[PDB]
Amino acid sequence: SMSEHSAIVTWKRKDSEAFTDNQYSRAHTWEFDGGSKILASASPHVVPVPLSVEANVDPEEAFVAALSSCHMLVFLSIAAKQRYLVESYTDNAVGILGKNSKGKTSVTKVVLRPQVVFSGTSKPTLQQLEKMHHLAHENCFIANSVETEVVTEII
Amino acid sequence: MSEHSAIVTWKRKDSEAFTDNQYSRAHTWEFDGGSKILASASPHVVPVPLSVEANVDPEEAFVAALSSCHMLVFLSIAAKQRYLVESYTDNAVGILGKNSKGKTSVTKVVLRPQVVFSGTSKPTLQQLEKMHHLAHENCFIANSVETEVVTEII
């Protein structure tokens, strides 16, 4: 059903920061309802380190992780319902910045490369796995919200 | 132009039956620079204790990515125009609903940024509004989504 999801994003000038020289820290915080606070930054592909902070999450990385996580969650529920025992699910996902059709810089492509380990006495075939991933992509809330071409390479 | 990586991992817990659909949705996100984030399904989507309230969920992350991206472009614009920004706080909300079509997706995200300027040179409202239109135009995440993204300034 319908739901709302909030994030508080906050940046504060450090005492030592001139700011107008563009040499301010891009570190900032993301705060969510359940109480968690995440240290964030601009991507180091767009703003050089040390202005960006490599150890902190960036918007592009979070975008890729959300798409990959959303797809995973749908898949796992499908696999449980088919009574397949999943031991692990690991996705090495990659997003690409490039120019979209309108000539604007965007995340034009995301490749999901999920590797799933099954156990127990009912394991699916290659054909079945493939259909579980197609259903997962079709019912992924995040994939359904984006212009990004989302491709799954099943590993 | 650039590549952005995420490793998303779920492992079945010891003794967790899974096939009963009662498994924990907690999992991890790992990024190149070493950040690990504890993740879950949203508790507005999956009840609890199947979802874990203190963990980040895909929907929350997608709202933060949009809000964060818009902010970072805004700040570089403000700094270029020689305004001194003391703070920027955006209380963002995204809404999951149907379409367009009939598929559940994030239909609308509303950004509500509040900016504190100090010092001698401060923008007028008109200048502030223009900085936000430019930031939205140049925000990579916003240029990636089909979501209606609206900015209500202040």
For chain A, positions 117-136, list CB contacts with chain B under 8 A.
none
Q: Which string of DSSP letters, residue by residue, matches A105-152?
A: EEEEEEEE-EEEEEESS----HHHHHHHHHHHHHT-TTGGGB-SEEEE
- Supply the DSSP symbol for A22: S
Q: Cβ of A15 under 8 Å from any chain B Cβ?
A: no
C-alpha to C-alpha distance for A65 and A7, rounded to whole angstroms: 16
The set of residues, in sequence order, having a beta carbon less than 8 Å from that of A113 and lying 6+ positions away, is A91, A92, A93, A94, A152, A153, A154, A155
For chain B, positions 63-122, list CB contacts with chain A under 8 A.
63-69, 71-72, 75-76, 79-80, 82-98, 103-107
Choose from B10, B32, B96, B149 for mutation: most chain A CBs within 10 A: B10
By what method was this entry solved? Answer: X-ray
The set of residues, in sequence order, having a beta carbon less than 8 Å from that of B7 and lying 6+ positions away, is A90, A91, A92, A93, B29, B30, B31
For residue A40, give the nearest of A63, A23, A24, A59 by alpha carbon: A59
Q: What are the structural domains, with CATH classification, of chain A?
A: 1-155 (3.30.300.20)
- Chain A partners of B88 at a C-beta cutoff of 8 Å? 9-11
C-alpha to C-alpha distance for B7 and A93, rounded to whole angstroms: 6
Q: Are B19 and A10 in contact (CB under 8 A)?
A: no
- How close B147 comes to chain A (CA, Å)? 6
* Paired sense of beta strands B36-39 and B104-111, if any: unpaired
Choose from A53, A63, A81 for mutation: most chain B CBs within 10 A: A63
CA angle A39, B4, B30 (to 5 degrees): 50
Decide if A142 and B58 are in contact by the 8 Å CB cutoff: yes
Whole-number Cα distances in Å, B71 to A111, B49, B96, B117, B135: 27, 34, 22, 14, 8
Task: Please state the separation of Cα A92 from the chain's center in Å.
Answer: 11
SS3 A3: strand
Whole-number Cα distances in Å, A114 to A52, A136, A145, B20, B29: 29, 12, 21, 23, 13
Give the experimental resolution in Å: 2.0
Q: Are A82 and A70 in contact (CB under 8 A)?
A: no
Q: Are A9 and B73 in contact (CB under 8 A)?
A: no
Task: Please state the separation of Cα A56 from the chain's center in Å.
Answer: 14
SS3 A46: coil
In three-state form (DSSP H/G/I as H, E/B as E, the rest C), the secondary structure along chain B is: CEEEEEEEEEECCCCCCCCCCCCCCCEEEECCCCCEEEECCCCCCCCCCCCCCCCECHHHHHHHHHHHHHHHHHHHHHHHCCCEEEEEEEEEEEEEEECCCCCEEEEEEEECEEEEEECCCCCCHHHHHHHHHHHHHHCCCHHHECCEEEECCC
- How close B124 comes to chain A (CA, Å)? 18
- Chain B partners of A50 at a C-beta cutoff of 8 Å? none
For residue B73, give the nearest of B144, B4, B6, B140 by alpha carbon: B140
Looking at chain B, which residue has its C-alpha nearest residue A103?
B143
Residue A140 backbone dihedrals phi, psi, to 5 degrees = -85, 115
Decide if B4 and A54 are in contact by the 8 Å CB cutoff: no
Tokens encoding A84: 């397949």
SS3 A4: strand
User: H or E stretch including A9?
Assistant: strand A3-12
Residue A4 pairs in a beta bridge with B95
C-alpha to C-alpha distance for B91 and B153, rounded to whole angstroms: 11
User: H or E stretch including A66?
Assistant: helix A59-81
Beta strand segments in A13-125, E: 28-32, 37-40, 85-99, 105-112, 114-119
C-alpha to C-alpha distance for A9 and B92, rounded to whole angstroms: 8
